[PDB]
Structure formats: structure tokens, C-alpha cells
From Swiss-Prot, chain A:
The keyword Acetylation applies. Keywords: Acetylation, Cytoplasm, Nucleus, Phosphoprotein, Proteasome. Belongs to the RPN13 family. Component of the 19S cap proteasome complex composed of at least RPN1, RPN2, RPN3, RPN4, RPN5, RPN6, RPN7, RPN8, RPN9, RPN10, RPN11, RPN12, RPN13, RPT1, RPT2, RPT3, RPT4, RPT5, and RPT6. The 19S subcomplex associates with the 20S proteasome subcomplex to form the functional 26S proteasome. The modification Phosphoserine is found at residue 127. Residues 1-126 form the Pru domain. This is 26S proteasome regulatory subunit RPN13. It is found in: Cytoplasm; Nucleus. The gene is RPN13.
From Swiss-Prot, chain B:
N-acetylated by NAT1. This is 26S proteasome regulatory subunit RPN2. It comes from Saccharomyces cerevisiae (strain ATCC 204508 / S288c). Belongs to the proteasome subunit S1 family. Present with 4750 molecules/cell in log phase SD medium. Interacts with UBR1. It comes from the Eukaryota. The chain holds residues 856 to 925 of 945 of the full protein. The gene is RPN2. Acts as a regulatory subunit of the 26S proteasome which is involved in the ATP-dependent degradation of ubiquitinated proteins.
């Protein structure tokens, strides 16, 4: 079970900008045992800052062929982890991993190799 | 000798190293290069801020303890 700081984020299909509503909390990601492809439970929990929008716990599964990641979708923020579900359960998350601050840095964090392995890894394989 | 000289006195000395009150007199930023004081160098110790001509070009930095520890 691998946990990191993350905020909730507001999505857009409007022009695909995806403007954050910053918050504070932890993402809890569970390694499960479900399947042999996709199927990682993304459950999000607040710790602090009830201001802006809030997301109570929802498990979200990694659905291959509907979920795509990129870190910039607008270049107004980076560190984005995108879970694309065509608005059937869509919610976006904004990582706030402290290693260089909670301020966004484009092309994810400043500990590149460590975050990159995960991001590619959830799509490819499962436990 | 000791008072007059103690041998081979010009060196190129970087930013943020052991620099004494004596050694601080003789500092000159080259004004033909990118980094020069906003005003003018104070000729003694303390924090000085250098105006940068072009930040688009990479330069070599030193990273702070502020980035590393949160």
C-alpha cells in the first residue's frame, strides 16, 4: 500500500484544461490482487483544507483503453495524474508530493525516475 | 615574504565560498558576462543579488536546503 500527498482536482472536457481546486490530503493506492492487468483502486482522502470542492472515498479502477495519462494538459500545472473515464465516474487528481514543495512542477516531480516507473506501471501490469 | 605577498595571488573564485574581509575587497564581477549586481558589488561580506540578462539560457546552479527538505 503506497500512499502519497494528493489533492482533489476538477476536470474539463471543455478544452481539456483541467483547473485544480488545490486542497490537501493523501491518496491511498492499494496494490490489490484483482486481475493481471489494470485494476488498481484509486481512493482519495482529505486531511486538511475543506475549502473548495471535496471528494469522499470512492474507489476508481484502472480501466485500460479509457484511462490515459499525460502530465501536461494545459501547462498551467504539472504533477497531474489523470484518470479518464468519459464522465461515467471521472475525477482527476493533482499530486502534491513534497520533495521540492507542494507547488506544481511540469513533467511531474523533481524526483523524475521514482514517479515515472509508477505512472507507466499501473497501465501495463498489476499485482 | 608574508606581508607583501605569499605567492600566486590571482585566482578565479566562485560564488558562495569562504571569502574573508580581506579577499572581499578585490572581488570584481566581469561586466562583460551575464551575472552582475543589481546595483554594484559592496566590496565586503553579506547577501548580494546579481541581475541576470537572460534566464532562458541554462546556467549551472546550486540547489537550496529549502527544496531538499520538504
Amino acid at each position: 500500500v503506497i500512499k502519497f500527498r494528493a489533492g482533489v482536482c476538477e476536470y474539463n472536457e471543455d478544452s481539456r484544461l483541467c483547473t485544480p481546486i488545490p486542497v490537501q490530503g493523501e491518496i491511498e493506492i492499494k496494490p490489490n490482487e484483482e486481475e493481471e492487468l489494470g485494476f488498481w483502486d484509486f481512493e482519495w482522502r482529505p486531511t486538511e483544507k475543506p475549502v473548495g470542492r471535496e471528494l469522499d472515498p470512492i474507489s476508481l479502477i484502472l480501466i485500460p483503453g479509457e484511462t490515459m495519462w499525460v502530465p501536461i494538459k494545459s501547462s498551467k500545472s504539472g504533477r497531474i495524474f489523470a484518470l479518464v473515464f468519459s464522465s461515467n465516474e471521472r475525477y482527476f487528481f493533482w499530486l502534491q508530493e513534497k520533495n521540492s514543495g507542494n507547488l506544481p512542477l511540469n513533467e511531474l516531480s523533481a524526483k523524475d525516475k521514482e514517479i515515472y516507473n509508477k505512472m507507466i506501471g499501473v497501465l501495463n501490469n498489476s499485482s | 615574504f608574508y606581508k607583501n605577498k605569499y605567492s600566486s595571488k590571482p585566482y578565479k573564485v566562485d560564488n558562495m565560498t569562504r571569502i574573508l574581509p580581506q579577499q572581499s575587497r578585490y572581488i570584481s564581477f566581469i561586466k562583460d558576462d551575464r551575472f552582475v549586481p543589481v546595483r554594484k558589488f559592496k566590496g565586503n561580506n553579506g547577501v548580494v543579488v546579481l541581475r541576470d540578462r537572460e534566464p532562458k539560457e541554462p546556467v549551472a546552479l546550486i540547489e537550496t536546503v529549502r527544496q531538499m527538505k520538504d
